[PDB]
Design a protein around this nucleic acid. Structure first.
Lengths: 94, 175, 141, 136, 38
RNA sequence: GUGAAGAGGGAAACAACCCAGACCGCCAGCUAAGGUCCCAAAGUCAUGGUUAAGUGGGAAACGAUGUGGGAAGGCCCAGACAGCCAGGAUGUUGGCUUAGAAGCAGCCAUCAUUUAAAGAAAGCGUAAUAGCUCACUGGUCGAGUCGGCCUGCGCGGAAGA
RNA sequence: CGAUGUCGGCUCAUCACAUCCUGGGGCUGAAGUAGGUCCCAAGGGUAUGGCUGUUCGCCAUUUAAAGUGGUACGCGAGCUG
């Protein structure tokens, strides 16, 4: 468990992805339940150290997205091909 | 930092505060030939004070320097220095004359330093030089030129060393 | 600086001394009087356990004269006697050449007590046990 | 050294790198080296590498070695005018890309593992970088 | 001092002193550990 | 795509690259790539920051307490970190081999206490022990610090007629 | 290719330093001794013969040392063939 602060993202595009990665922010999604996907962009640097412990992948996250919270799990992770940066993490509401 | 944020000059000695030199003055030696470069001049009762000259952010490399550098001259006019400077092996003489010191290591020809003032030569022996000196900087240099006639070497030990024995020893072989 | 000076230490037999290799040159360098010590040492060694190697520490003065304090024989040696062996085990811990009862160690610890720092008998006794384990000498309660 | 025992074919083309990976994760290992950069292992590089590791980790842990070299790559011999025939197989190269996992240690501390891999490397032809086991 | 491109540090008495662009190494003990560049 | 069969403008000069297609003329104007310190036309421009190498103005493997920028972690006024005062005890000069190799030639042992705390030990030293210093531990001082990481710019590596 | 004379020698050099000697140092398994190896250093110097068309090489005897390489594998509107 970690109580992550991340926030709305809203532009789809590889390009726009490249623009995100110029900040620490990497794009990312919550999807799950009966409500349409929530396009957020978490902060790498926080999340880097937090995903380094096993606890992340194992107990509940509660991703605080502008003032509300959604409890998810981090399932899958498409990180950078060779750098300790991330590029993406899929999160399924569980 | 540490030293560079440490201030101390006693009332045993005296000063000629100036805005571009830090002068001490007195007896037993005196006079200061290190000068400002990168540091201010402030004063205090018990300290000849200086922080870094402004418009330069690297001036505390020069300051921690300036610090020990001032106080050492003060130690020179209160206490001796360069305390002795021995030499391993023998028949390597002395002179101790007007300010020249001869020393042999198979020198047919004399080897001398007409020393500056403020550094004394003395010995009782042909294996030793006993110098009290003032102004750690000054002295130390002229002091080196002496022992620098021949370097100490490890395979028979001989060669003008320092006060303390800080050689390496490697066995000879082929006997 | 350079120089050198005395306060030497050595382990010589009880009633025997003077040999050059064992003694002689050893302290002779410091400026000790071989002859004097030879008789002087063996003099008191008569009272002390004869035939047992006792370590003596000689301290020379500027007078070139000297004094020495006869302590108790090494724990290793004492263990050899108690175990009734002549030498160690070569490869201690791996192969035991002898054994010593927990009672004996206490006796040896009592003998070495004078030279040991052990605050209590347990400490001194263990101090020797560490020497025994290093000699390949097992200790049965 | 290392090559197809029954060859699919004798010769093959230059090939191109397009970089990146998908092969990015230890699956036997717990520590590992990934790539940075691109190149070829001529398999005398794999061989030298297997060697240097083994002398260090000893008979603790176990080693795996991802990529086995599968592109021949010819060299047409010396002192003949070029373009008269394709050359002959003097090599078995292993086209490697960034993030492509080389080797794989297990069974030994994070530090030992690094300073066994640091020792192997340099007999590798590109810049490397460390892998930690990773929960995934 | 002993001249190479690189040989890193050599013991725990290898201080690594930088005089000019080259990186020398002072050593308490061995003069063979002293590097001009290494 | 250009050149061929295209001048002109830029890239020092430089068929092809970059910019731009010359009906012709005008001591006309506005721009373009590219430039504005002088040669040599125009900013010694504004703002903010980085670099110390003359990098800029040739190079990689690799090495580094060079610096800048970012994040986490370990230790810290209940006093860390370094040095200094020191602890450096005691069993302890354990065995083969050698009188004597008895932590440190080689081979084995790689334990434990005294305690508040102190490795049979990293090297020097010694044939080898003895001793000296040290990852190891006690005191003084007085405020941040120690190694790794990502990452910008540097450094060395960088020798020819 | 509407002629840019080949190699080698001779003669005459000249440059570069990746230096053979001298010079100055580092390390040394540096006893001394000459060295070994590496760093800096082109100021100057840097062999004659025997054989072979060969430069080279091999051999002989010195020399402080007989450097290496470049200059149309230097040099024929200078010589030789």
């Amino acid at each position: 468990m970690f109580t992550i602060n991340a926030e709305v993202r809203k532009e789809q595009g590889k390009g726009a992805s490249r623009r995100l990665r110029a900040a620490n922010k990497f794009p990312a999604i919550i999807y799950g339940g009966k409500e349409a996907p929530l396009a957020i962009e978490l902060d790498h640097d926080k999340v880097m150290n937090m995903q380094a412990k096993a606890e992340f992948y194992s107990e509940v996250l509660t991703i605080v997205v502008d003032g509300k919270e959604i409890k998810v799990k981090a399932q899958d992770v498409q990180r950078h091909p060779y750098k300790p940066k991330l590029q993406h993490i899929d999160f399924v509401r569980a | 930092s540490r030293v560079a944020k440490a201030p101390v000059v006693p009332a045993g000695v005296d000063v000629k505060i100036n805005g571009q030199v830090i002068t001490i003055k007195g007896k037993n030696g005196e006079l200061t030939r290190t000068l400002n470069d990168a540091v201010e001049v402030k004063h205090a009762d018990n300290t000849l004070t200086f922080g870094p000259r402004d418009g330069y952010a690297d001036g505390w490399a020069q300051a921690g320097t300036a610090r020990a550098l001032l106080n050492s001259m003060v130690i020179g006019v209160t206490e001796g220095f360069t305390k002795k400077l021995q030499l391993v092996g023998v028949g390597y003489r002395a002179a101790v004359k007007g300010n020249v010191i001869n020393l042999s290591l198979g020198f047919s020809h004399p080897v001398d330093h007409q020393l500056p003032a403020g550094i004394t030569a003395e010995c009782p022996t042909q294996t030793e030089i006993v110098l009290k000196g003032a102004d750690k900087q000054v002295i130390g240099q002229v002091a080196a030129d002496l022992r620098a006639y021949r370097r100490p070497e490890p395979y028979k030990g001989k060669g003008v060393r320092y006060a303390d024995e800080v050689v390496r020893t490697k066995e000879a072989k082929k006997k | 600086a350079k120089k050198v000076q005395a306060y030497v230490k050595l382990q010589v037999a009880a009633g025997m001394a003077n040999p050059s290799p064992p003694v002689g040159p050893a302290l002779g360098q410091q400026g000790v009087n071989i002859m004097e010590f030879c008789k002087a040492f063996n003099a008191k060694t008569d009272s002390i356990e004869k035939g047992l190697p006792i370590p003596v520490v000689i301290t020379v003065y500027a007078d070139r004269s000297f004094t020495f304090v006869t302590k108790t024989p090494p724990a290793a040696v004492l263990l050899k006697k108690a175990a009734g062996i002549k030498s160690g085990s070569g490869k201690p811990n791996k192969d035991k050449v002898g054994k010593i009862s927990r009672a004996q160690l206490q006796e040896i610890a009592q003998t070495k007590a004078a030279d040991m720092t052990g605050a209590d008998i347990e400490a001194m006794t263990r101090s020797i046990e560490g020497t025994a384990r290093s000699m390949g000498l097992v200790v049965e309660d | 050294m290392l090559q197809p025992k029954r060859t699919k074919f004798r010769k093959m083309h230059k090939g191109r790198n397009r970089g990146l990976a998908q092969g990015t994760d230890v699956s036997f290992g717990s520590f590992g080296l990934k790539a940075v950069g691109r190149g070829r292992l001529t398999a005398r590089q794999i061989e030298a590498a297997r060697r240097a590791m083994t002398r260090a980790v000893k008979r603790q842990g176990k080693i795996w070695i991802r990529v086995f070299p599968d592109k021949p790559i010819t060299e047409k011999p010396l002192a003949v005018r070029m373009g008269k025939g394709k050359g002959n197989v003097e090599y078995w190269v292993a086209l490697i890309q960034p993030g492509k996992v080389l080797y794989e240690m297990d069974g030994v501390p994070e530090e030992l593992a690094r300073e066994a891999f640091k020792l192997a490397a340099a007999k590798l032809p590109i810049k490397t970088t460390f892998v930690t086991k990773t929960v995934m | 001092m002993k001249v190479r491109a690189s040989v890193k540090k050599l013991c725990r008495n290898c201080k690594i002193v930088k005089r000019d662009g080259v990186i020398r190494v002072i050593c308490s003990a061995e003069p063979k550990h002293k590097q001009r560049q290494g």
